[PDB]
A and B are shown apart, each in its own frame.
Chain A
Amino acid sequence: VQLVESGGGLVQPGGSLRLSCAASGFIVSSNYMTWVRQAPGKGLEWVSVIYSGGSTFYADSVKGRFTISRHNSKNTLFLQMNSLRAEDTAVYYCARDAQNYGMDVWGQGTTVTVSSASTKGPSVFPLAPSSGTAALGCLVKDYFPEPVTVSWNSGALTSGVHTFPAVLQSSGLYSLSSVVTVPSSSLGTQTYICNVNHKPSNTKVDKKVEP
């Protein structure tokens, strides 16, 4: 009893994309099948629904650009995303709506990113300590697309590390920082290096952070 989604990716504004959802424990043509999305840090908004008898309905922010549809042959639900806008960036879910009995089979979620940015490796800057406990960190500025991972001293420093979620700037690029607290007494003795890895750009940076 499962829904398997697929077909998300990066596209650029005004582009096109096609999401697919394959069903195991029920018949898609016998059911209300709904498409629901969730933007970064927001709630679940409705997108599209197909009725068992064929009728389709759409969220007002979406009419005339998306198409819900289905092939009976495969229990597969489809969403055709045309004229994409950055607006539409979110995780998309299919779900079977049993109405009174609730939305009971949900997809894993597939991620749809709409942006005109170019993939760019970050510039790593030092967040240098200052003049009992002392904080230092790195600033991972101006990168795209999303996945960036940060470690310290190739892994041998985990206590007091906080790597923050990324923020999306007006430029369409992400920033984040990771910070760490250490004894002030160690400041000049122990070397603190941060290790940044942005895989979409094949970037790997080590940056020493020193008073």
Chain B
Amino acid sequence: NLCPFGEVFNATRFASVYAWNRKRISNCVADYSVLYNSASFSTFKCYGVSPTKLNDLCFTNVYADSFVIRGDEVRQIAPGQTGKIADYNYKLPDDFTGCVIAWNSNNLDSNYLYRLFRKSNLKPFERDISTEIYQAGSTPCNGVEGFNCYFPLQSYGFQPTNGVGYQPYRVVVLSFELLHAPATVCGH
């Protein structure tokens, strides 16, 4: 009973950051070094943990969240950051215990959107799919797009010849929870 890390990493379609996908991982074994020793990721920073000890640890549940994002925006997928992605799309908690994995995705991904308008910053692990027209004044917008009345999601214009900073990157955030419950994900 190996863990389906394949089904998330090697997947054909990734989701827009604003509507990121979450895979819950449970009742399985997990070689965390088929991932660390690959030389196929450009970003792989771990916060509450160290990858070497990951095959010597058990966790109640593991969550794998995935989406696409610009290269210059992978920096926001860390605890304590601000910016349009961290604020309105995907927020990591200050007290985060997990791993953030990204790789360059230009060959497969060059549609994807992100949320540009929200009145307040997102809470950690909040997911806002709302496509309500955004109210930037005191006048109601009524599904009508116009002055003070903006569509909340705009498109990444992913275009293969842009510099690495504006090229699509695929990201997987591994969240590791320990609860007072029978562990089900054991590295070995």
Contact = CB atoms under 8 A, between A and B. Distances in A.
Interface string A49-80: 00111110000000000000000000000000
B141 to A, nearest CB: 11
Interface stretch (B48-56, B131-139, B166-174): B131-139
Contacts of B154: 99-100
A31 interface: yes
A55 B81 CA distance: 10
Nearest to B134: A30
Contacts of B150: 98-101
Interface in B142-156: 147-148, 150-151, 154
A140 B43 CA distance: 63
Contact of B138 (A27, A54, A101): A27
Contacts of B148: 25-26
A55 B137 contact: no
A151 to B, nearest CB: 46
B119 A30 contact: yes
A12 B146 CA distance: 44
Size category of the A interface is: 10 to 19
Interface residues of B, number: 20
Given A55-B82, A99-B154, A101-B150, A30 B121 contact: no
A53 B120 contact: yes
Contacts of A30: 119, 135-137
A85 to B, nearest CB: 27
B121 A54 contact: yes
Interface in A30-47: 30-31
Contacts, number: 44
A55 B136 contact: no
Contact of B136 (A53, A54, A98, A100): A98
B83 interface: yes
B117 interface: yes
A52 B118 contact: yes
A25 B137 contact: yes
Interface in B113-131: 116-121
A26 B117 CA distance: 15
Nearest to B84: A51
B118 A53 contact: yes
A148 to B, nearest CB: 42
Contact of B116 (A25, A55, A99, A104): A99
B88 interface: yes
B117 A52 contact: yes
A74 to B, nearest CB: 14
A31 B136 contact: yes
Contact of B87 (A29, A53, A98): A53
Interface of A: 25-27, 29-31, 51-55, 98-101, 104
15 contacts: A25-B137, A26-B148, A27-B136, A30-B119, A30-B135, A30-B136, A30-B137, A51-B87, A52-B120, A53-B87, A53-B120, A54-B121, A55-B83, A55-B87, A100-B151
Given A27-B137, A51-B82, A55-B83, 12 more contacts: A26-B137, A52-B118, A53-B121, A54-B121, A55-B82, A55-B121, A98-B136, A99-B116, A99-B117, A99-B154, A100-B116, A100-B154
